[PDB]
Amino acid sequence: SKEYHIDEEVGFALPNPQENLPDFYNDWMFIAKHLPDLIESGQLRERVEKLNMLSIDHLTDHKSQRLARLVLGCITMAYVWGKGHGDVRKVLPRNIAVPYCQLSKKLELPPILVYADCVLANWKKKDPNKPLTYENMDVLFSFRDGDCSKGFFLVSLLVEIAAASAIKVIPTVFKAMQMQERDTLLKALLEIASCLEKALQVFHQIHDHVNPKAFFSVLRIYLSGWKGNPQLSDGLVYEGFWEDPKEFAGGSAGQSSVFQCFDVLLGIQQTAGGGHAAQFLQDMRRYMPPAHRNFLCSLESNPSVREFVLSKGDAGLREAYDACVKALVSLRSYHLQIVTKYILIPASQGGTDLMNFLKTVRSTTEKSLLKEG
Amino acid sequence: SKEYHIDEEVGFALPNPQENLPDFYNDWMFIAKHLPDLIESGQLRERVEKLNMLSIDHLTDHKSQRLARLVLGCITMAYVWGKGHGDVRKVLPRNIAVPYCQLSKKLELPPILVYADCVLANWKKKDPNKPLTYENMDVLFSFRDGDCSKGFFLVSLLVEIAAASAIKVIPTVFKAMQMQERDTLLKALLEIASCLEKALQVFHQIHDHVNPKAFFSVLRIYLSGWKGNPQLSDGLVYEGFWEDPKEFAGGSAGQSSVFQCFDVLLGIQQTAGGGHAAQFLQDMRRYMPPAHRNFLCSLESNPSVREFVLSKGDAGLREAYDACVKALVSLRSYHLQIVTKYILIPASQGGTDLMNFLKTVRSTTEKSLLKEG
Ligand code: HEM
Numbered sequence: 001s002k003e004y005h006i007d008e009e010v011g012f013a014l015p016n017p018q019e020n021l022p023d024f025y026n027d028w029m030f031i032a033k034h035l036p037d038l039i040e041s042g043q044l045r046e047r048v049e050k051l052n053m054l055s056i057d058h059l060t061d062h063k064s065q066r067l068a069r070l071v072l073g074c075i076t077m078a079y080v081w082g083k084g085h086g087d088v089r090k091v092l093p094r095n096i097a098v099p100y101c102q103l104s105k106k107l108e109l110p111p112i113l114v115y116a117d118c119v120l121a122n123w124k125k126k127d128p129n130k131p132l133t134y135e136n137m138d139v140l141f142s143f144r145d146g147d148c149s150k151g152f153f154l155v156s157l158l159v160e161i162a163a164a165s166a167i168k169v170i171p172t173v174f175k176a177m178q179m180q181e182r183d184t185l186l187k188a189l190l191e192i193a194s195c196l197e198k199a200l201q202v203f204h205q206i207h208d209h210v211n212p213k214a215f216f217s218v219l220r221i222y223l224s225g226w227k228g229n230p231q232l233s234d235g236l237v238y239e240g241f242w243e244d245p246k247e248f249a250g251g252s253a254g255q256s257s258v259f260q261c262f263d264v265l266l267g268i269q270q271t272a273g274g275g276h277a278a279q280f281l282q283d284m285r286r287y288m289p290p291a292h293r294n295f296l297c298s299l300e301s302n303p304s305v306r307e308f309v310l311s312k313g314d315a316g317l318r319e320a321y322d323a324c325v326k327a328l329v330s331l332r333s334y335h336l337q338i339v340t341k342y343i344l345i346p347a348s349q350g351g352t353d354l355m356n357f358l359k360t361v362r363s364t365t366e367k368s369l370l371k372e373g
Numbered sequence: 374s375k376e377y378h379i380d381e382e383v384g385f386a387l388p389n390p391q392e393n394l395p396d397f398y399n400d401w402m403f404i405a406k407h408l409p410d411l412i413e414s415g416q417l418r419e420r421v422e423k424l425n426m427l428s429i430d431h432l433t434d435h436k437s438q439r440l441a442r443l444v445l446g447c448i449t450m451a452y453v454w455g456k457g458h459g460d461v462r463k464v465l466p467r468n469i470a471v472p473y474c475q476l477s478k479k480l481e482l483p484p485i486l487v488y489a490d491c492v493l494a495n496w497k498k499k500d501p502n503k504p505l506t507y508e509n510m511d512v513l514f515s516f517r518d519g520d521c522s523k524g525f526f527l528v529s530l531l532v533e534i535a536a537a538s539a540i541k542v543i544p545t546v547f548k549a550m551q552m553q554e555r556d557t558l559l560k561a562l563l564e565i566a567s568c569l570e571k572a573l574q575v576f577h578q579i580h581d582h583v584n585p586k587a588f589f590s591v592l593r594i595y596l597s598g599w600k601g602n603p604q605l606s607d608g609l610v611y612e613g614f615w616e617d618p619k620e621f622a623g624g625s626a627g628q629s630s631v632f633q634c635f636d637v638l639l640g641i642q643q644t645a646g647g648g649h650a651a652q653f654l655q656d657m658r659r660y661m662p663p664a665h666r667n668f669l670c671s672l673e674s675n676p677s678v679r680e681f682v683l684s685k686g687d688a689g690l691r692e693a694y695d696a697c698v699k700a701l702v703s704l705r706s707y708h709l710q711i712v713t714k715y716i717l718i719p720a721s722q723g724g725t726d727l728m729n730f731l732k733t734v735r736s737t738t739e740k741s742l743l744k745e746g
């Protein structure tokens with residue numbers, strides 16, 4: 001762990017995200033901040049075309065250009081979708097698309113808003129001395145008023161932070177596998193399982209901050225993409241950067257590195273002969289920061305912990321490994337239970353495909369256990 | 374150069390491939406060796422459907438179970454595509470599917486024939502002592518008679534080898550970036566550039582040995598997979614193993630580890646952007662020997678050569694870099710020249726999707742140049 005951009009406190013989240021851009025990009029910042037207003041009042045799209053072409057070079061360091069990608073991503077989502085009710089836009093203005101794509105190419109990310117810049121790069125502590133707890137922090141950007149995006153992004157971010165506690169351990173696991181020290185390894189697996197169960201609570205204790213009208217709410221349509229989307233059948237033209245419409249997938253927490261990482265570590269079959277599930281999740285790595293998608297790979301570069309633990313005929317080891325897998329099914333489940341409270345409930349007078357997707361992943365997790373319970 | 378299985382003399386190719394399996398696997402070694410005979414006669418699908426389900430216990434050392442993969446592989450393509458005319462099989466026999474997937478999950482490869490299978494692990498020396506040259510060499514397997522097998526696989530392999538002479542220069546490039554030895558880098562870069570030049574020269578001098586009407590021969594039908602293939606809507610069933618029909622891509626020379634690794638090294642980033650071709654080559658990585666994707670990624674873990682050369686304001690070093698890109702572009706252009714000559718022209722008396730895919734891969738290589746202003 002050196003140049004994988006995994007922070008030891010906040011994990012895959014961008015630590016202390018920059019919340020102010022150079023004055024040069026104030027018009028960008030303005031539209032972005034006042035997203036909820038500009039949309040409902042209708043002038044957003046106008047205020048977007050009002051923008052002249054700005055160069056991205058004044059974005060000197062990593063963090064600033066990161067905030068830029070957030071600012072522009074939102075602006076883009078706001079522009080494409082508008083009030084969200086159906087008035088789409090098939091062409092993104094050159095004075096936005098060109099900077100967006102240039103910077104997007106630079107940071108190695110598709111020119112669409114992703115989990116990495118919408119959750120992990122979209123936050124700040126209120127009082128910089130009080131710890132990272134919900135009541136001490138806030139988002140930087142939301143789409144419309146009462147979309148609960150504050151709570152949605154913040155909790156996910158909090159679960160993301162909570163998982164970092166286990167990342168620290170990973171080298172210990174691979175090292176303890178190499179030098180062949182059962183006791184250290186077993187010890188370390190329990191510690192991971194311990195941290196993954198710690199993540200369950202931040203999920204439990206903090207599920208209070210999303211309103212049952214959040215899917216059916218204005219969100220979800222703002223995180224919608226233009227890949228296989230009937231509304232932009234062929235994708236969005238990024239005017240002055242691409243002669244042709246390009247398709248990019250929308251938002252999915254499949255772009256959260258955390259869960260993929262431990263899916264990999266524990267050898268949970270996430271390539272399992274393809275299938276929408278394992279395949280989707282894979283090509284969702286293309287939407288992760290180049291350093292994180294790189295860390296993921298690197299884990300598979302390492303030998304399987306699952307193949308090791310099997311072969312040792314070690315009861316305490318299996319249980320320890322099972323304890324981690326149990327921790328994931330627990331996580332996936334409470335997530336799934338929370339999801340059903342949000343899809344067949346606000347289906348009141350497409351949403352069942354997701355229900356399957358979740359369940360196939362969770363199932364692949366469950367089938368990984370070594371004691372059937 | 375460590376645990377990546379990159380032979381000093383033969384690159385990514387299997388060091389010295391095993392010709393004969395263990396005595397046990399003779400029910401297989403027979404079929405595959407007499408495979409052209411058995412397709413035309415229309416007895417292949419039958420002989421396979423009446424076969425002993427030999428267990429994978431007796432194939433042990435690396436060279437053997439890779440030969441096993443090749444054998445089982447061709448057999449599977451023969452059994453699915455039949456004569457190459459219409460008639461198709463959607464299910465693979467328990468007796469041959471199960472030991473194949475047992476060996477596939479074992480060797481961490483997908484249960485389809487691969488470039489690594491039928492090019493890297495498919496050859497021999499007629500005269501064991503003398504150099505690796507065309508006439509000195511012959512393949513181990515084929516599908517039909519005059520089906521263009523030898524030349525295609527052999528020329529590929531010979532270019533793959535020719536290119537490998539550079540893989541050994543890779544560590545220096547990263548050492549010279551670390552120790553910061555400007556001269557050493559420039560030198561090592563010119564050498565890599567020259568290795569690519571030499572491989573194009575090899576391509577020139579042996580291009581003929583590939584049969585002029587190879588694309589249209591049954592070959593392409595036998596190298597067809599079951600991923601986004603209309604003919605196998607849901608993909609092949611490996612029954613006994615997985616109850617569901619599973620989905621895997623047919624052979625593409627985008628599984629050639631060398632070409633991808635020079636893309637990576639020079640920072641051509643074919644694997645970035647999330648676009649159609651971007652996601653493809655990234656997915657083809659899963660169809661490479663495990664030892665090999667790891668190496669590809671290691672390269673990706675390392676600092677960017679392109680970045681380093683851009684930063685230094687060093688025209689000599691810039692030039693030596695371009696030399697490499699030009700050399701990789703030349704390599705691709707000549708390839709595209711012969712692809713046009715073999716596939717476009719004879720179409721008259723998908724054919725475009727292929728031409729487009731190659732062109733972008735070439736274009737995004739040509740675009741990686743430096744000295745432009
Ligand atoms: C509380 C409101 C939430 C709802 C309604 C919700 C809904 C969903 C839905 C519908 C999917 C499948 C569609 C997709 O993203 O591809 C999903 C996937 C996912 N969600 Fe959430 N989610 C919520 C909160 C969270 C939180 C707090 C986390 C933790 C960071 C999380 C992590 C994930 C992950 C990792 C996936 C990918 C599926 C997997 O790996 O199993 N979600 N979510």
Ligand code: HEM
Pocket residue numbers: 528529530532533583588624625626627628629632705708711712715716727730731734735
């Ligand atoms: C002259 C006979 C050949 C023909 C007709 C031919 C045709 C093609 C076609 C149609 C593709 C795109 C389909 C795909 O693989 O996804 C392709 C890709 C490719 N071919 Fe060939 N090929 C030939 C010989 C070679 C040889 C000898 C090599 C050297 C190993 C080579 C290396 C590649 C590579 C690396 C790709 C991936 C795309 C790229 O890197 O630009 N080909 N070839």
Ligand SMILES: Cc1ccc(-c2csc3ncc(C(=O)NCCc4cccc(Cl)c4)n23)cc1
Pocket residue numbers: 113114115116118119152153156214215219220223251252253342
């Ligand atoms: C840019 C971005 C990406 C992922 C997340 C995120 C964090 S936690 C989580 N679970 C699911 C998602 C997600 O965005 N999925 C798409 C569908 C969907 C989106 C929002 C609400 C609903 Cl109800 C359904 N997500 C947040 C932002």
Ligand SMILES: Cc1ccc(-c2csc3ncc(C(=O)NCCc4cccc(Cl)c4)n23)cc1
Pocket residue numbers: 486487488491492525526529587588589592593594596623624625626627
């Ligand atoms: C399993 C396997 C994979 C790749 C190769 C190979 C080595 S060099 C090269 N160029 C293209 C390919 C290739 O097979 N691509 C598929 C399209 C195609 C192109 C030309 C002729 C035909 Cl018959 C088919 N290829 C050989 C075996």
